[PDB]
Amino acid sequence: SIVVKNNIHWVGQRDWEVRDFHGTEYKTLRGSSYNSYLIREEKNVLIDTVKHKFSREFVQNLRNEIDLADIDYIVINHAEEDHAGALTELMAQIPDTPIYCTANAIDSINGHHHHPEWNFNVVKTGDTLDIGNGKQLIFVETPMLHWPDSMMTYLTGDAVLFSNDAFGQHYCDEHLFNDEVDQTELFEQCQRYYANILTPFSRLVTPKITEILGFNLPVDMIATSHGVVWRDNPTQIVELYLKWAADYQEDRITIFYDTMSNNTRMMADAIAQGIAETDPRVAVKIFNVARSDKNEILTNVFRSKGVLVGTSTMNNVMMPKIAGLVEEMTGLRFRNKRASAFGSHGWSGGAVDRLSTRLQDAGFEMSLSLKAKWRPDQDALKLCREHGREIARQWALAPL
Amino acid sequence: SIVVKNNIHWVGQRDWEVRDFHGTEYKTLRGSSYNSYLIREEKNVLIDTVKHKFSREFVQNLRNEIDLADIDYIVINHAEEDHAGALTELMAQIPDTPIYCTANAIDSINGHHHHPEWNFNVVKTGDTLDIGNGKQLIFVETPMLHWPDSMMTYLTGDAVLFSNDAFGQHYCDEHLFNDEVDQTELFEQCQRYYANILTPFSRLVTPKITEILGFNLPVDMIATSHGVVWRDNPTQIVELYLKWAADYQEDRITIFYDTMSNNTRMMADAIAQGIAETDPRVAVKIFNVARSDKNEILTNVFRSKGVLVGTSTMNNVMMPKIAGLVEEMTGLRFRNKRASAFGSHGWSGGAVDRLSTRLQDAGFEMSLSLKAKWRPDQDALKLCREHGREIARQWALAPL
Ligand SMILES: Cc1cc2nc3c(=O)[nH]c(=O)nc-3n(C[C@H](O)[C@H](O)[C@H](O)COP(=O)(O)O)c2cc1C
Ligand SMILES: Cc1cc2nc3c(=O)[nH]c(=O)nc-3n(C[C@H](O)[C@H](O)[C@H](O)COP(=O)(O)O)c2cc1C
Ligand SMILES: [Fe+3]
Ligand SMILES: [Fe+3]
Ligand SMILES: [Fe+3]
Ligand SMILES: [Fe+3]
Ligand SMILES: [Kr]
Ligand SMILES: [Kr]
Ligand SMILES: [Kr]
Ligand SMILES: [Kr]
Ligand SMILES: [Kr]
Ligand SMILES: [Kr]
Ligand SMILES: [O]
Ligand SMILES: [O]
């Protein structure tokens, strides 16, 4: 275990090997961690657990830190399997131990564990839990951030905010604190996390942070459930969340496509050139969805002011990976972004219009489409270059 | 080169390494071949070429077999890059050589190569081309099998049908003839090919084969553009095509899904059990689309009488891989098949109905959906088992 602050002990689990989260929908290229915390004042409080596959090690390590019978209260901020997965294993040893959580958490905890006989205690925003020595836990409900059961626990005196998923990132390191790790690698994982997970809940992020700041409670540390503990200027991740929530976009255009014989690829490269030689301020990224990291693509879309999506016409419809990715974007609900569909066809085509429509369904403001037959020759590549020019002029943030 | 029959020489290219076709949409687990044929009578005729990346070797090997100037005619049955990719390289040495192909082939050849100055000769069904010694080539147009430019060339006397893509398969072997290779491995690749490529054109397969049989031309060998040359009972692949075209299905149910925390997986296994203990005649396959071969899944759907598709609700929509796969199935246009959507959700859900609708759009006859909240307990797993029972009774081919 690692001493977080005074009597706060990190008793979680590092995961260096993990490469897949939420099925295979979130690639964790730098691993992750599952942060559990043991607070030992007059009362002994355990905050969240770890993933189920590390339950054996979790309980054993917990035994080495404290007798399980001496644990007074258990707090569950979030009942997703990576934070409450070791719950059944632990409650088998101490079934009478009270569990403090939201009303929605009872549904989610029981939904996974099927032990409704456990002693649940419904908490709501403002509720307190005294642990002795002048310190107490203050609960704040954060529904749909990112789950209905989500909440945060604040420890007075030590001024430590247990935010669970919020302000966390999938980043594994032997050092626990943010000022002890690589800042660049830390920022990438933080932005990668929000873009792929918290984007559809951005409208809720700002009012919640505003509400919490209204409590006027000091924050010395922010102990998330994933990644580093923010102790050195901890509110820096809060400020990033405020910026990322306000329909974040840079002067950047993300182009991604799928192709069977490189015809659409040729179009994408010609479009990109037209943009770069029209607007030097625009950062341009290009991805083949069949050969690229899906989450890296989505992170760029989040940072971009607009995207161009390419697909060849395959069996009167679009290519599956493109359709799949667009479907996911429909759930992420990106805002204040523009889009243009393009692609090659053999005869009748139809996949470009089909794509443009679904992008509109995903919330993108659609510009005109670009279509080409078979492999683009020099003349066709000019039209693609010109399309990029028209896009660059239409999507220009400042005049030029 | 390999002697196919008399003066027919195989001058194509084997591809042991290839693992991806049509982008990454067709996995070639046993490699493939690109069959080109040189006929040397009084006239010298080249039939199709190879993929562009093997163009250097193709021309060189062709030089070792014959002087390029001695080539009289060039036949292009199909202008896809794997059969006409080495065309530009070859025509650079012999630009005056006539090219015999369909009217639609001129559009496709020029579309890729951009050399309209080539000497094209439009052929239609019934047209002949004398090559001497009492032998001649007879052309038969096969539009949308699988391309608009597709055609077949028949050689009289030797009774050899050059079918290009038709009756071919992606299977690489040192031996050229069908009776020299592994029959099981040969059948798998043949069925894998049709299911993923020729399924949406099944309505056209039967009348075309009927028309060709109406010509009363003998067939000693069938020389495709991919895989083995059928010389031992060559019509066996024709009979398989007739069966596969007639909305082929076995007493078989294919279940596939995507899951984030295995809840939907638990549902799929419970459904499968219900079916097996209700109808012992049904063959059941289960696939996680995130961890399985996509084409193996589609091959099973082709053989199946009906499918069950699972998805968890993710951001108010379905999982991308499922959406992507369903999109592709919408293009494959499977016929006379039934379907049932299922999956787990956290709160409001919605992805199961969304999936059931798109399956209906894909042409599946939809049965009732099955929904479960979070992780299924013993009671919920009974409902899933019962759902399988109801499906097994509804989809039963014979009474029982
Ligand atoms: C399996 C397959 C299916 C196709 N289906 C269509 C189609 O339905 N309509 C069409 O106009 N072209 C169709 N085509 C032709 C392609 O759209 C054409 O080759 C395109 O220019 C290539 O795009 P890409 O190289 O960027 O992947 C199909 C090609 C393949 C290989
Ligand atoms: C990223 C993510 C998004 C989710 N979105 C929804 C949702 O929009 N609606 C819902 O009812 N449940 C949602 N859930 C909860 C899942 O549907 C729930 O955990 C489900 O039972 C798990 O299915 P599975 O384990 O088979 O993948 C979401 C879960 C995750 C991890
Ligand atoms: Fe979570
Ligand atoms: Fe988490
Ligand atoms: Fe082809
Ligand atoms: Fe082919
Ligand atoms: Kr969160
Ligand atoms: Kr937040
Ligand atoms: Kr906050
Ligand atoms: Kr074909
Ligand atoms: Kr055919
Ligand atoms: Kr035939
Ligand atoms: O989580
Ligand atoms: O092909």
Question: Per 3-state DSSP, what percentage of chain A is helix, strand, and coil (rounded to 5)?
Answer: 35, 25, 40
Query: Measuring CA to CA, which residue among B186, B225, B215 is closest to residue B86?
Result: B225
Ligand 7, atom 1: nearest CA belongs to which residue? A166
3 state SS of A214: coil
Query: Measuring CA to CA, which residue among A259, A261, A266, A273 is closest to residue A351?
Result: A259
Looking at the structure, tell me whether residues B213 and B308 fall in a common domain.
no
Domain membership flag for residue A400: no
**Domain total in chain A:** 2
Chain B residues closer than 8 Å to A375 by CB? 111-112, 114
The tokens 């390191």 sit on which residue?
Answer: A173
Strand-pair partners of A222: A161, A230
- CA distances to B283, B356, B358 from B365, rounded to whole Å, are 20, 10, 11
- Which residue type sits at B368? L
At B5, list the tokens.
Answer: 């029959």
Beta strands in A111-186 (DSSP E): 120-122, 128-132, 135-141, 151-155, 160-164
Query: Helix (H) and strand (E) counts for chain B?
Result: 12, 23
Number of CB atoms found within 10 A of residue A209's CB: 18
**CA separation for the pair A6, A185 (Å, rounded):** 28
**CA separation for the pair A203, A224 (Å, rounded):** 21
Domain membership flag for residue A399: no
Cis-peptide, bond into residue B146, ω within 30° of zero: yes
At A126, list the tokens.
Answer: 């403002």
Do A42 and A24 meet the contact criterion of CB atoms below 8 Å apart?
A: no
Query: Measuring CA to CA, which residue among B141, B105, B138 is closest to residue B120?
Result: B105
3 state SS of B12: coil
Query: Measuring CA to CA, which residue among A97, A105, A189, A174 is closest to residue A142?
Result: A105
The tokens 């915390």 sit on which residue?
Answer: A37
Rg (Cα) of chain B, in Å, rounded? Answer: 24
Do A228 and A167 meet the contact criterion of CB atoms below 8 Å apart?
A: no
Tell me which of A246, A277, A296 is where a domain ends.
Answer: A246
Chain B residues closer than 8 Å to A81 by CB? 261
The verdict on whether residue A33 carries a ligand-binding annotation is no
Looking at the structure, tell me whether residues B239 and B266 fall in a common domain.
no
Looking at the structure, tell me whether residues A221 and A269 fall in a common domain.
no
Handedness of CA B166, B167, B173, B174 (dihedral sign): negative
**CA separation for the pair A339, A308 (Å, rounded):** 6
- Which residue type sits at A26? Y
Of A114, A148, A291, Cβ closest to residue B347? A148
Looking at the structure, tell me whether residues B226 and B275 fall in a common domain.
no
Beta strands in B158-295 (DSSP E): 160-164, 221-224, 229-230, 252-258, 283-288
**CA separation for the pair B50, B78 (Å, rounded):** 11
Do A89 and A55 meet the contact criterion of CB atoms below 8 Å apart?
A: yes
Q: Do B346 and A315 touch (CB under 8 A)?
A: no
Tell me which of A246, A263, A298 is where a domain ends.
Answer: A246
Nearest CA-CA distance, residue A383 and chain B, Å: 16
- Show the domain range for A29: 1-246
By what technique were these coordinates determined?
X-ray
Of B290, B319, B330, Cβ closest to residue A317? B330
Looking at the structure, tell me whether residues A224 and A258 fall in a common domain.
no
The contacts of residue B183 (CB under 8 Å, 6+ apart) are: none
Rg (Cα) of chain A, in Å, rounded? Answer: 24
How far, in Å, from the CA of A38 to the mean position of ligand 7?
A: 21
Query: Measuring CA to CA, which residue among B43, B54, B42, B53 is closest to residue B11?
Result: B54
Q: What is the resolution of this structure in A?
A: 2.2
Looking at the structure, tell me whether residues A230 and A276 fall in a common domain.
no
The tokens 């499977």 sit on which residue?
Answer: B334
At B64, list the tokens.
Answer: 């070792």
The string of DSSP codes covering B122-164 is: E--TT-EEEEETTEEEEEEE-TTSSSTT-EEEEETTTTEEEEE
Q: Which of A313, A347, A374, A384 to mutate to test the pocket of ligand 1 (most atoms within 8 A of CB)?
A: A313
CB-count burial class (<10 Å; 0-12, 13-18, 19+) for B389: middle
The verdict on whether residue B12 carries a ligand-binding annotation is no
At A173, list the tokens.
Answer: 């390191």
- Which residue type sits at B127? D
Query: Measuring CA to CA, which residue among A354, A318, A288, A315 is closest to residue B196?
Result: A315
Handedness of CA B50, B55, B61, B62 (dihedral sign): positive
Domain membership flag for residue A51: yes
DSSP state of B25: T
**CA separation for the pair B332, B175 (Å, rounded):** 32
- CA distances to A140, A262, B243, B284, B326 from B250, rounded to whole Å, are 57, 37, 11, 11, 21
User: Is A115 in the active site?
Assistant: no
Residue A200 touches chain B, beta carbons under 8 Å: yes
Beta strands in B279-328 (DSSP E): 283-288, 306-311
- CA distances to A8, A74, A166, A292 from A39, rounded to whole Å, are 5, 10, 20, 43
Distance of CA B393 to the CA centre of its chain: 32
A151 lines ligand 7 (CB under 6 A): no
**CA separation for the pair A63, B8 (Å, rounded):** 79
Do A290 and A257 meet the contact criterion of CB atoms below 8 Å apart?
A: no
Backbone angles phi, psi at A379, to 5 degrees: -65, -45
Q: Do A374 and B108 touch (CB under 8 A)?
A: yes
How far, in Å, from the CA of B380 to the mean position of ligand 14?
A: 48
Distance of CA A43 to the CA centre of its chain: 34
Domain membership flag for residue B79: yes
The contacts of residue B153 (CB under 8 Å, 6+ apart) are: B47, B75, B77, B137, B138, B139, B140, B161, B162
Task: Give the best residue of B88, B150, B328 to mutate against chain A (max A CB count within 10 A).
Answer: B328
Query: Helix (H) and strand (E) counts for chain A?
Result: 12, 23
Query: Measuring CA to CA, which residue among B84, B71, B73, B145 is closest to residue B110?
Result: B84
Backbone angles phi, psi at B120, to 5 degrees: -85, 145
The contacts of residue B261 (CB under 8 Å, 6+ apart) are: A22, A23, A80, A81, B312, B375
DSSP state of A119: -
The string of DSSP codes covering A137-156 is: EEEEE-TTSSSTT-EEEEET
User: Is A193 in the active site?
Assistant: yes
Distance of CA B333 to the CA centre of its chain: 13
Domain membership flag for residue B399: no
Strand-pair partners of A344: A372
H or E element, residue A193: helix A183-193
**CA separation for the pair A278, A273 (Å, rounded):** 9
Query: Measuring CA to CA, which residue among B372, B392, B44 is closest to residue B251?
Result: B392
Query: Measuring CA to CA, which residue among B203, B294, B199 is closest to residue B254?
Result: B294
Strand-pair partners of A2: A10
Do B25 and B35 meet the contact criterion of CB atoms below 8 Å apart?
A: no
**CA separation for the pair A123, A121 (Å, rounded):** 6
**CA separation for the pair B90, B56 (Å, rounded):** 9
**CA separation for the pair A39, A45 (Å, rounded):** 5
Domain membership flag for residue B338: yes
Q: Do B374 and A111 touch (CB under 8 A)?
A: yes
Backbone angles phi, psi at B211, to 5 degrees: -65, -45
Nearest CA-CA distance, residue B68 and chain A, Å: 28
- CA distances to B148, B202, B242, B328, B334 from B197, rounded to whole Å, are 14, 10, 15, 11, 12
- Identify residues whose C-beta is under 5 A from ligand 4, the ion: A 82, 165
Where do runs of H (alpha helix) occur along A215-259?
A: 236-245
Distance of CA A243 to the CA centre of its chain: 15
3 state SS of B5: strand
Do A238 and A163 meet the contact criterion of CB atoms below 8 Å apart?
A: no
Backbone angles phi, psi at B329, to 5 degrees: -65, -30
3 state SS of A52: helix
CB-count burial class (<10 Å; 0-12, 13-18, 19+) for A291: exposed
CB-count burial class (<10 Å; 0-12, 13-18, 19+) for A215: exposed
At B274, list the tokens.
Answer: 């219900």
β-strands B229-230, B221-224 pairing: antiparallel
Tell me which of A222, A246, A270 is where a domain ends.
Answer: A246
Nearest CA-CA distance, residue B266 and chain A, Å: 12
Cis-peptide, bond into residue B387, ω within 30° of zero: no
Nearest CA-CA distance, residue A337 and chain B, Å: 19
Strand-pair partners of A3: A9
At B214, list the tokens.
Answer: 């109406």
Residue A260 touches chain B, beta carbons under 8 Å: yes
The string of DSSP codes covering B275-336 is: HHTT-TT-EEEEEETTTS-HHHHHHHHHH-SEEEEEE--BTTB--HHHHHHHHHHHHHT--S
At A253, list the tokens.
Answer: 């255009």
Q: Do B374 and A108 touch (CB under 8 A)?
A: yes
DSSP state of B177: B
The verdict on whether residue B139 carries a ligand-binding annotation is no
**CA separation for the pair A194, A241 (Å, rounded):** 8
3 state SS of A177: strand
Chain B residues closer than 8 Å to A321 by CB? 24, 324
**CA separation for the pair A231, A228 (Å, rounded):** 9
Do B186 and B242 meet the contact criterion of CB atoms below 8 Å apart?
A: no
At A236, list the tokens.
Answer: 């820096």
Domain membership flag for residue B279: yes
At B294, list the tokens.
Answer: 């996509």
**CA separation for the pair B349, A194 (Å, rounded):** 22
Q: How many CA atoms lie within 13 A of A93 on its CB side?
A: 16
Backbone angles phi, psi at A43, to 5 degrees: -105, 150
Looking at the structure, tell me whether residues A297 and A240 fall in a common domain.
no
User: Is A226 in the active site?
Assistant: yes
**CA separation for the pair B381, B378 (Å, rounded):** 5
The ligand 2 site (C-beta within 6 Å) comprises A 22; B 259-264, 312-316, 344-349, 374
User: Is B82 in the active site?
Assistant: yes
The tokens 């002029």 sit on which residue?
Answer: A393
Looking at the structure, tell me whether residues A260 and A155 fall in a common domain.
no
Nearest residue of chain B to residue A354 (CA atoms)? B327
β-strands B8-10, B2-5 pairing: antiparallel
State the Cα angle at A319 between A314 and A321, rounded to 5°: 165
H or E element, residue A187: helix A183-193
Ligand 10, atom 1: nearest CA belongs to which residue? B166
Query: Measuring CA to CA, which residue among B10, B26, B12, B23 is closest to residue B297?
Result: B26
Of A112, A259, A291, Cβ closest to residue B375? A112
Looking at the structure, tell me whether residues A228 and A306 fall in a common domain.
no
Do B267 and B344 meet the contact criterion of CB atoms below 8 Å apart?
A: yes
Q: Do A24 and B114 touch (CB under 8 A)?
A: no
The verdict on whether residue A14 carries a ligand-binding annotation is no
Looking at the structure, tell me whether residues B68 and B137 fall in a common domain.
yes
- Which residue type sits at B235? T
Looking at the structure, tell me whether residues A82 and A215 fall in a common domain.
yes
Q: Do B318 and A332 touch (CB under 8 A)?
A: no
Domain membership flag for residue B400: no
Nearest CA-CA distance, residue A292 and chain B, Å: 12
CB-count burial class (<10 Å; 0-12, 13-18, 19+) for B199: buried
Ligand 14, atom 1: nearest CA belongs to which residue? B80
Looking at the structure, tell me whether residues B100 and B198 fall in a common domain.
yes
**CA separation for the pair B351, B344 (Å, rounded):** 9
Strand-pair partners of B178: none
Do A314 and A352 meet the contact criterion of CB atoms below 8 Å apart?
A: no
Do A35 and A165 meet the contact criterion of CB atoms below 8 Å apart?
A: no
How far, in Å, from the CA of A87 to the mean position of ligand 13?
A: 14
At B279, list the tokens.
Answer: 């109808």
At A389, list the tokens.
Answer: 């020019």
Task: Give the best residue of B315, B316, B332 to mutate against chain A (max A CB count within 10 A).
Answer: B315
Q: How far apart are the first and last CA of chain B?
A: 57
Gaps in chain B with C–N over 2.5 Å, residue before each: none
**CA separation for the pair B72, B42 (Å, rounded):** 10
How far, in Å, from the CA of B83 to the mean position of ligand 5?
A: 8
